Amino acid sequence: KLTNPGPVPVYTVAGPSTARPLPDWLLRRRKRSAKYDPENLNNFELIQEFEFEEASNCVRVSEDGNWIMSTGTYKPQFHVHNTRELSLSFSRHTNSENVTFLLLSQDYSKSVHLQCDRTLEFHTPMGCHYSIRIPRFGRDLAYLRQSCEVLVPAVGLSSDGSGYGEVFRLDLERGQFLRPWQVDVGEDEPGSGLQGSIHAGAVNVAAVAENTHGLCAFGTSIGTVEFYDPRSKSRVAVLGNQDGEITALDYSRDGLSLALGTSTGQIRIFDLRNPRPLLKKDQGMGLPIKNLIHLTTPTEERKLLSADKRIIKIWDEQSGDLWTSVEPLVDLNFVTHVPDSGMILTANEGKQMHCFFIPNLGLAPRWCHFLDNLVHEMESEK
């Protein structure tokens, strides 16, 4: 366990030490043949085999909070960790490196992921209910719970009909692809394929709510965020022309305000009715931001920011002041938080999946109680 910042401490309790680790073969050879003096006390892991030896893609904790599903790269697989028993429940291999999954049930008993070789794979604990090829490539994955329907964005322009751009949506009770929700992306070359060209033609992020009204918000590469309403099956809004490709989309706890962000590193907190921004922040460097979620220390509200320049900044919403900043020392591809408090699980490029602990945003979760006492022992050490 380390501590990175001065004023408000974060705690890298599990994580890769070096930006260029050696091959694990050479590491085990030097460990079993050489003499070494490691920090036996403070260095540990908290859940068993929380690594992938190549890279990682996404982490999600269930609404029951007992299961951590995580997908990673070599022999492209997904680990399911039971978090009460602090170990691997299992790990199941797949056909290619996963893009993005969601849990459907409150447990891990139903999963779906959009997967790099243009597939959607539906997973049970029994095995794998069979895959559906989406026609065109995909970027994200969202779930309409009230009318159970998976919706994925697509890059590129459609085959026939209009040339807007498409969001592929299939219901689970009905079973078929209903109709692609048509989102304009822009103009493309008439001379190309049917998968698009290299420069543009991409819808990126789809975001919905699951306790409020739930306006299906999409976001596409010419600086455009769109809004669709369920039970209308048609467009409501087109707004937010920016310079950067929209990579962030997340509602707040109330169900009104939106936190979007662009590929240059600029975030805008919008209201759903005011065209002028409630908040703007131009931070980091020119590497594109990835993921932003709202998180409430039990009284206040604050916001995440995670960007591939190894910058994850927790901003304030009520004042806009930079509350804290973490340097994960590697590329990180996904952030999630334990829904109780405190713990940010981050899927990275490195070997080990790394998780941060904020004592000043919340407490240790209900399955690893002693983390607060370990922070206490580090406070004794300093």
């Binding site: 070096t18 930006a19 260029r20 050696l22 050479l26």
Partner: protein, 176 residues
């Protein structure tokens, strides 16, 4: 020696200066003997290039260490791919301005040498040896690599290289 180089670099890092502070991870991997050739092209041509503000602070330490790695006989193979390509891969990536300090640590006693005076030949210098016949060979192989990697940019360093090569040449021509 790799162990003494590691302990010496640990003492240099015990000197806690902000010019060496962002480069410590890049420094220690050069002494880790499995990642030297990859760490060289991480250091140079990387996103974390040496910043010209504290380039004046890191370069003597870095060049003494790279000199030691170019000297060391243990991990290198035989032939050219053993250690000749290592010397070439250090000198090909070094700058021509750092190359002055590189040849400064290269030529120990022959740094301040004079072969020619107002008269013809300094027989007082030539009838004396400051270096072993074992040691001049690695010097000449290194300067061959320096010249073959520099080209024209030897022009600011003409005054000492020719004295070194001429001294070793005429000591050989006396020893035939």
């Amino acid at each position: 020696d790799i162990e003494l180089q590691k302990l010496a670099l640990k003492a240099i890092l015990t000197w806690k200066s902000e010019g060496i502070k962002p480069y410590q991870e890049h420094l220690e991997y050069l002494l880790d003997e499995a990642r030297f050739k990859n760490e060289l092209t991480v250091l140079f041509q990387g996103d974390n290039k040496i910043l010209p503000e504290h380039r004046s602070e890191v370069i003597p330490v870095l060049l003494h260490l790279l000199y030691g790695r170019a000297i060391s006989r243990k991990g290198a193979a035989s032939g050219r791919h053993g250690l000749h390509a290592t010397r070439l891969a250090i000198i090909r990536q070094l700058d021509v301005e750092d190359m002055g300090s590189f040849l400064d640590i290269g030529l120990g006693p022959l740094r301040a040498i004079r072969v020619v005076d107002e008269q013809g030949v300094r027989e007082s210098v030539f009838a004396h040896e400051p270096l072993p016949p074992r040691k001049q060979v690695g010097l000449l192989n290194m300067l061959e690599a320096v010249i073959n990697e520099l080209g024209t940019s030897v022009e600011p360093y003409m005054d000492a290289l020719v004295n070194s090569v001429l001294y070793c040449l005429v000591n050989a021509c006396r020893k035939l």
